């Protein structure tokens, strides 16, 4: 009863095992077990490890055990020496079990490497340990250095090299791997049986040998023919993985996000809602002539009940409802603070600082409230630091919610506006006040002791009502009683007036169609001499002097950096790079990007006048773009799915595992790529659910279960349906996957006829079940007229079918069914049975009625579809030249021993499969076919019970089906049924679905850099959406292992990949390159990945570093624009991946910037005159500045959410 | 290996073993897909040695064969073989 | 083994006995209520006395001594009879 104790401990000898990390979690090695069993031995025989050559046999892993980040686990060994079995117990608790005992004599030949089945052209490109390990890491393997043991690796993943630093767990864990790597299952896969495993230290030392460096390795080959690996003085034979859930918790959120113009001022910007119109007109209709569950309709309604006119001024100021302070609920009242108005200020504000932390105190917090709406808006900014703080009349006020003060790191203060700022405030970076629900003391006193309290150039944000608009006369007339809130309300040129009395200056004014205004004013700086400094012109020689410019650090003198000559100048990128920088607070900047040549180009000189204005207002960022004056801002983008009309739909579950995640989306049967001679694309009317589209939805049943060849992104629901075919006629078939959709391809074999007399409701339910019965029965077991045979769960479709067919020859069946109902179900569907005919399947008592009612014989022929125990009785029922028909696959897959006993009697027992049919054997299928249709000619096949949902509820059928109470087949009516017989109108009807991006196969597509590893996985992914013909660019082309790994696998799937090797910085270069590419086909896409990246501060660029990094992305961008809009006319996708540089700006990457803003600019330029574009800003890749690296699977996913958004430019990143 | 090697790794439809012990679990790794295994030996079944069912998920058929059954019981299922063997 | 719920007898490093053995959880007397028998015979004039039924035995080659002769009786055919109890 040997007893290991596994710490992870630093100080514990095995903290190596923290570096076996799979699937996020420590899970403890499957060779650990190995080692520590032979261990057990060594000590039981008295010999020790290096001198004790072991043999394992039948070795299955029962669970995984997880180590905890603290803590210990125990692990109990016995070992049975009679039996030469093991047993490995944790908490008393099967884990691992087998056979080991000594290896008597040991052969050295069985070490010696087999003839290598895999041909070997001495290629010189190898992986090498990093690309192996991050091939390991895309499929979902983490290991850590301990475990990372392969130097090297042939491409096909035939023979490597693996270290041996004294551990041999690393060393066949290393062997596993190797294993692992070669093998085309995308997923992760871990052991669970193990064959023969044979150990010999001797032979170990014997073969290792050491390179020219000190270490020590030892070379392995691994054969999938003969199906063994061999390295050093390992032997494993007969290694079965089965594939891990793979679902990992706590995955990354993406705060995606859109990126648009937003002028400085604009009016109305409620218009778009409907709500807070019909609020309005329900507001004015009350106050007419002097309902609803929002306030101030409330309160309007008390005004008037109480008193038609002439109201008390205390009641209508104190009823009930009227005086909790739920003003501000009010929807009228939370409009602009709602919309992104609020958060676009607030950027604005924040772009507008030296310090990156910020200091902001909110007056009179008990009422506006704003203290739990303000700090949520600036969490995207990653570095932003923040230091709030509310002001309130009275300490009494706003005591309560002090809680969700709590949860933010908000102040408490009690400063009133009326009198100066405590000095605990200060020089406040920010003051917000929110006059719209609370009450102003007064203008003058407010605002003086305010603009009083602000820092030199700091903002102060304003929300108020506007006097003169329907809202303030409306408040007007009420709220009497409070003439401090009277003082509140002014009009907008009584503002304006009084800013210029306090000498503050309005940068931004964001007013609602109701007249609700978000004022944005900043206090002035002290005025100083500017720099005018042009950037617009090429060859980036201007850098010396703005580098001339910044070296006087003593100086003050602001930098404004104008660029009015180019719309596509990324100056915009440019000024935020440095502002991160030392002395980038002195930088400004002047863009003119009209997008249209018909709009106003003005003059930005210095006599002329709006130059002063734009001084004036002092702000970073001063982009001029269709007669306006604003800066480009981050908004939230919008969290829904979008959706579109379509003809083509399949159900899928966009969250493996969660039933409420079924929804429609759209096929890639859009295109009829897949549409070809041999096959035909057939409306669907109705599919069937079956239980394996249940195992995959519910996430028990992985998508690499189903045989054949399926795409890592798919959808596998459905294997019969019953639709019309494309000349009109009524049909019902049978497909490996796919079928609950809108829409299958299939080959015309697997397609029958239904009946006049049957209507296509029923013929959704005969193809699986009497196909697989009529196999199983006929073709395997070749049953004769007049047998006995014992058909487990008769209410099961496949029992019903099978006991249709057998009753048709004459044989006496014997059936299990689970209840009463059932049993009486059957009766009365069968009349042929009798009582004594049925047995309880939910027990084991049926082998008695079997044997007894037969006369101590049995039965000839058992279907079998239930579990161990029960399978292991069934087995006992089998008569002389019995035959078991077994259709199960638990027990199959479990790998459950079977007695050969029932041999000694002449008995056949069938492994039943009816998926081996689809991607195999289609000839002999014909035979079933041929079955069926005889059988459905002669009345035998009948349809089964079926329940209807519509294509709506998709989501109650499954929990119908999942329920289990079903006696029958559940099926989904995708399309109702038309009187007609043939109808050449087969066009399936619109269905709006969410959007996937799926590309056509006879259309080229080009990816600029694409050898890179971000263009290699976006390559990979859009060949999961059927590219077929692909252009990759790189200057210096294919020069390693990975890339070339996966050109030719690419190329071995029949895709024509293409390594151009054509700058696209020179137009020479782009035109050949697109003309390259319409060889192959029509250009589809063309993607800009080209990067050549050159860090340092600004003093230490120069004008070429700027060259080198803008010509594969600027210039490149630019003559792939052009070379495209002359050269591709069906083209449909041109992207460009920016970064998070721009926009956000990062220290000593100014170049990037530019470049990335510079090629942005293009993108939008596009899509304004409708053709295509799409500038991307990504945070940081994976697997290939305050966010955590974005793991790849994510990115693709945002990545197909971006492509279909309506949008030009987006962007996406994690948090710390 | 044999086996295994010269059949490209998918392995042999029909197997006639009259082998026991390990050899006959040596056999049935030999199988392919829609692979027959015909067991006319008689050591392993008498003493009811383990047999592994993972075999069956690929789509194999095991069988055993004795021809002794026809002579104490008759039957027409003879006749079919006595034909095999006068055409033969 | 009560992990995998397996015993084995050995005799001096040798095994004799293995199979498996666990507790009953859930103990249910109807598994003990007496099949019918096949053929009723009501009348069962006759039966095999103690000393027939073990001269039978005896002449099959079965030498059971006093200690472990325990039937009573038993049917003609053999299906039932009584077994005498020695709590042993
Ligand atoms: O990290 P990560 O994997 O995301 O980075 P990455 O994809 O490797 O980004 C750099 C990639 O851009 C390619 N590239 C740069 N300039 C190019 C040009 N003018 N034409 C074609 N390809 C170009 C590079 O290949 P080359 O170095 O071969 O250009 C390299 O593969």
Redesign the pocket.
Known sequence: AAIYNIDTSSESPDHYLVDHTLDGRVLFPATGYLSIVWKTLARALGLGVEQLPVVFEDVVLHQATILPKTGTVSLEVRLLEASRAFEVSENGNLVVSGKVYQWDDPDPRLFDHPESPTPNPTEPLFLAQAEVYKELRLRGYDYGPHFQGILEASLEGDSGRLLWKDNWVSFMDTMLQMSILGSAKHGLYLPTRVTAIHIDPATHRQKLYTLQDKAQVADVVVSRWLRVTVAGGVHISGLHTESAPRRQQEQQVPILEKFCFTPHTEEGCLSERAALQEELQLCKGLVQALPSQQELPRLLSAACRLQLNGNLQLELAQVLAQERPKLPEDPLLSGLLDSPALKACLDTAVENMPSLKMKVVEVLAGHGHLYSRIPGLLSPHPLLQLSYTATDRHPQALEAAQAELQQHDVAQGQWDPADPAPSALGSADLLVCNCAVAALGDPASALSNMVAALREGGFLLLHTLLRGHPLGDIVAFLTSTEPQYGQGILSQDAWESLFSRVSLRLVGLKKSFYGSTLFLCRRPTPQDSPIFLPVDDTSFRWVESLKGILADEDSSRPVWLKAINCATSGVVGLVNCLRREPGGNRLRCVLLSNLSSTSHVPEVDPGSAELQKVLQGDLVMNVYRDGAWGAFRHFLLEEDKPEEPTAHAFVSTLTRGDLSSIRWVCSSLRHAQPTCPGAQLCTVYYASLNFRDIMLATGKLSPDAIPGKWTSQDSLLGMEFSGRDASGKRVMGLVPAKGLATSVLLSPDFLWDVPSNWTLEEAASVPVVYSTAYYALVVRGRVRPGETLLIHSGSGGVGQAAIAIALSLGCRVFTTVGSAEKRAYLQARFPQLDSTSFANSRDTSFEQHVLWHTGGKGVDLVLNSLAEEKLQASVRCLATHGRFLEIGKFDLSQNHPLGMAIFLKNVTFHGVLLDAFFNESSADWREVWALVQAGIRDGVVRPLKCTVFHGAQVEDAFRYMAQGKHIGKVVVQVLAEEPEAVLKGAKPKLMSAISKTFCPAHKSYII?????????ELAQWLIQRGVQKLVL?????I?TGYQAKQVRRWRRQGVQVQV??????SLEGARGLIAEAAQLGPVGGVFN????LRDGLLENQTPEFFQDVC??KYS?TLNLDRVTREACPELDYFVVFSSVSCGRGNAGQSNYGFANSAMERICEKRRHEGLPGLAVQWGA?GD?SGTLPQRMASCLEVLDLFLNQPHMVLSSFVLA
């Open positions: 600029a850099g694409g050898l890179g590893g971000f263009g290699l660019t790189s200057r210096s082309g020069r151009s090797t054509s700058n696209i910085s990945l080209a990067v050549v010509k594969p490149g890749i290939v």
